[PDB]
């Protein structure tokens, strides 16, 4: 049973060199705050107990089953689910005792997206592999990442990849940090351009005379269209506890502006039906409304240019598992 035990690197902990190949990052669900990825881990260590003389055995390398020798058991804390593409992996041992193990796994990890600037947002996704059954005094990790992503035409593009071994760790672990950027024009074309078009159409329709019956129906139809579009947008966007996307606030402000315009039009048309004062009031309101729309657009642009979130470090992030 001594074979299952971790090899002893004298006083120093055993060093395991891990190479991570990120094959693909396919599902990035902002609503579920999860990112799905595919990884290949090549773990290399030295096990002098498995070394054999070349005279007795002429093979320069042998293959052993997963449970026939010590292999680190990696667990991902942020991963909702992990699917290992080999239920019975085989480790490879050289004549000098070097052991190499290849593991292909598809995971759905947790990513804290910074959706403040949706749909142009940069997020950091961390995949932390822990050797829970071992301690840092026995196991040490040396992690490298290779960018082997096979899909590039997706909405979210991975542009920065790094690996790091956090210090002051009791449980040996290594984390791969990747940076995700959104380059999808679907949201903009689908919702932002039609929303601005509807807002400009309402502003233009403000020039219709108060006594025109067609003014009311046109405004109400625009309001209904914007209500449908706003419902679609908010259903298509997640809600954060602290920093919701500025897009939903901007759309809510525009919806309130459209409601205010429609309500003013209806109220003044009713008062007129009951140059008179309501017509002058309507003209003044139209000017104030145009000025307010321009001011709102400028204010939203300024907020987008200069925005930040302190947010709050999660208890897992503030106090990582197996520290100190």
């Amino acid at each position: 049973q001594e074979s299952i035990q971790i090899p002893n690197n004298g006083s120093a902990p055993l060093l395991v060199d891990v190479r991570v190949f990120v094959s693909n990052v396919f599902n990035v669900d902002i609503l579920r705050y999860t990112m799905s990825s595919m990884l290949l881990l090549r773990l290399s260590w030295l096990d002098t107990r498995l070394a054999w003389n070349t005279s007795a055995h002429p093979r320069h390398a042998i293959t052993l089953p997963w449970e026939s020798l010590w292999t680190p058991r990696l667990t991902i804390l942020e991963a909702l689910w992990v699917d290992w593409r080999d239920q019975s992996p085989q480790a490879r041992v050289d004549q000098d005792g070097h052991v190499k193990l290849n593991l292909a796994l598809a995971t759905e990890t947790n990513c804290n997206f910074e959706l403040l600037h949706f749909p142009r947002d940069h997020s950091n996704c961390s995949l932390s592999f822990y050797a829970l059954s071992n301690t840092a005094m026995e196991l040490e990790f040396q992690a490298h990442v290779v960018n082997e992503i096979v899909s590039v035409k997706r909405e979210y593009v991975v542009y920065d990849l790094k690996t790091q071994v956090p210090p002051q760790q009791l449980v040996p672990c290594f984390q791969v940090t990747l940076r995700l950027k959104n380059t999808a024009l679907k949201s903009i074309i689908a919702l932002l351009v039609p929303a601005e078009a509807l807002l400009l159409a309402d502003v233009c329709g403000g020039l219709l005379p108060l006594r025109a019956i067609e003014r009311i129906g046109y405004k109400v139809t625009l309001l209904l269209s914007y209500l449908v579009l706003h419902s679609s947008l908010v259903q298509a966007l997640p809600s954060s506890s602290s920093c919701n996307p500025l897009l939903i606030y901007y759309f809510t402000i525009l919806l309130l502006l459209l409601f205010l315009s429609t309500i003013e039009t209806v109220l003044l048309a009713g008062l007129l039906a009951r140059r008179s004062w309501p017509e002058t009031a309507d003209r003044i309101f139209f000017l104030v409304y145009v000025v307010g729309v321009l001011c709102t657009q400028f204010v939203f642009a300024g907020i987008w240019m200069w925005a930040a979130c302190k947010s709050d470090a999660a208890p897992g992030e503030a106090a990582p598992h197996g520290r100190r």
Copy 2:
């Protein structure tokens, strides 16, 4: 085969210290009344039969497979499904016989959400781990919970976590109770603000003269928009047997008010077309309608401020499994 048997702590039952780290609570489906979480259980006990002399073996700790020694089999009653992130877990045994076992599991448990005050509701979710194959006379649990949640910007935020071992239990068990609060602005912005805006727009449109043809079409378009919004809300909200959310009742009342306003407008316009009496009736109805809308808003606010549900304890909750 004696190794598989549970260790004997003399007359007293064996004590197992369980530490639970809640890594994340990601899916909280109100429609399915289920909450999905990720947990790490560290179970520590003492097995003097596994102790070895340090002279014979110089290793201070060894690793054994899952089935090579006694390990408690934990089962979650409320969990729809449990996925263990290690099909072949390894227990760690010290030279003194202390055994530590780490198990990472993603579960989808059942939570009875108190959706009366949606979208601002506080719910209690209980995850009960039972050792069905054992009895309380042989196994005893000591549970502690560590808040290591890695996601904080989700709609539902866990703010209170506790562990408790219910008394008078035949089957040894321990339950982790967490408190879930909803901090999502998606529902409010998506549906409550547009609903109030539509209600105020209808109230304002009540001032349109009865003889105005544009009055009818405007009211009907508002009614159609509110019908779409109400259908979306009710489809997006679950139905409870006893205490449905007050939001659906409030929206139904508002929809009935809009239908009443539209029906009155159409009826009086038709009667007038066939200061006359219909105009006076329309003015009186408009005043009564405004007063009724204000009264309804105040009544709903008062109900929200002072509401409660006796509800009913479920048979599983009233009579937990393995009691007495």
Copy 3:
């Protein structure tokens, strides 16, 4: 290999006492005609071959792996999928030879819902456990059910639970029958109240004069709203081969009535535009339409009060597997 063999209860078949605890019934999908449940089965039998003298071994109870002794293999015929929450269950054997086995399983079984009276329908769901590898001459089942349901605020409520062992069976089996009732107000509030409101609004709008241009647009907008609502309802309701819900027929009749009203209004307005005869015809049609709506409501209420379906027993239900 004799341990794996079923114990011999002399000439009579071996008796296995099964206790079923229904922890929860969470998914009840009318569209898929499936019901998802969670069960705990405690199977107790007597195996004198496993009895041991208390002098040789002081343990009063031992635990054995799943494959180390004979354990009945239960299969559910109606279950779309079964997930056992313990891949390596352990049986418990007393010193007298009594064996107790606990199995927690989440299943998605097939339920033939009687959706004639949707959304107030009572259905019977049967979960049949068969020991396919055994015969009735060797294995006998004694089943009891304990109501330990942990969720009570769901749309569907289980109110009656029973267990029965069908007679004249070749393959030993036992079935748990539960009664499901629908107490969800979501469907009613979402679709029935708005449909009746739209119907009453159309009836009231029938009083608009034929020469009023606003009459046509109002009717068409109501027709469009009812078309959307009807499409939503029919998409949200399953279709049965024999007895479709009366709700879809009632909504189809109401939709046809609305189409007839709109078509009559348009036809008579066109004829008038080309007390004149069209106005008298419109008044007579309005009276006939109101009478017909009242008669249709009364007829639907009477049908709901007195309705039944002979339906047809399925081949599996008429001829259960392993009978005679």
Copy 4:
């Protein structure tokens, strides 16, 4: 290791009698072209090597694990996924050597639906079980099917079931062919009746005078309603490479007719606004439109009565695996 080897039936191949019980056919997804079913396979063969004298052993039947004796490994080619409801099945061996094995499996196989006459279409679904590891010179299959379907009130009803062993096969296989018919009224009530109602409403609205302003808005609202309904239908129906359903073509033709009517109405109203000639043209177009609608309905009925598809045999269907 000779026990694992297939028994030798002299020169002739070993004969395995397979009885298939179709418990249920639950998911029939036309969009995915897949059919989900549940089957119980009872495989009986003769293994004289397992026969034992009744004097040495008094048991008339024994149970053996899945891997302790030769059992054919059945694979389904058309099955997207197969879930075996017993990870460790047990075979039953009599004293004479007869071996019976029961396997319960839920599969999602591929069915080539003939959706030309949707929603009244008849399709053939074939489930082919192959013994890939064996050859026809060693293994022979004798398949029978028993109709034990437990669900009868679903949209799709299985009415014909057969089993056949294709000739000139190298890999021994047997296929179960079932006939699926659609008896769902959901599609008709949801979409066909409203579409015909909208078409008749548009035809009736054609009688509105050209100078009536209400004519244009009514036509456009009907056009919008039909656009929504058409989008819903096409989204709810799959697209075939060769024979798309005639329903989508019929709805496209009706949509084009509605667009033509609306465009003609708008064009002639504009020309008139700029008995005059446009009124005569509108009357002639209305007559031609009514005649064309009737002719289109008759032509569609005739096409439905007399329609066929040569289609094309798939490479798998034309050249089945393991033939010749």
Copy 5:
């Protein structure tokens, strides 16, 4: 343990002949950029260590379990998930030592669809099988593909299949490349024909006089219908980082044209209400709008005829795993 080791083909690497039968390609999700397929791999090699004399054993072929002999472990890099339809496959060994292994697997691989010309696009999907545990100096692959697809009436049709073993590989691998073409008329009929119909209807409605009140409402209703259709299309189409489909750009241009037409109509009607100059401006704008619509259609047709994407090779595609 020497049996598990890879056979030695002298100095040259061992040659494994792989035959791939593509049973079906069922799910082609453009939104997820994934393609789901079903494959049967027949791997044949020579293992002289397993050869036996025909005199000692009369069997001409034997079956061995998966782990009783060396079998290459194939891993798919692009596959999101792989489901092997046989958890315990059996290899077949002849008397001469030839070993044949049949593996049926359903995979969901990653395909980089060239969605520029949606819905008529040709894509290349590559399924790469790697023997990670082995090196090219020991293992060599010879791959052949057989077109045994059983489904032909799906939206996406596979018309070209090839296999290739990339040169200069360290890890032995072979990739199957298939060509996917879209033959679905669902998208065209659902969205392109209605969009062109709406555009032509708006062009025709441009002839309505500026003083006609019905002109504004008709234009706004067409705009709302096109907004709904555009939202449906963009929701139904994925967004690419580099080359989004030209269809979304064309629909955005048409939506902008409709917004411009509606805004111009409203502005000029308002100015006129406040042959006059606005009428002449409206006529000139109508002519310019018709010319612009024709020019836009011609430009889009020309772009469709002559379009290309340089795009960018993904890091995995540019530098395949296990090269050099």
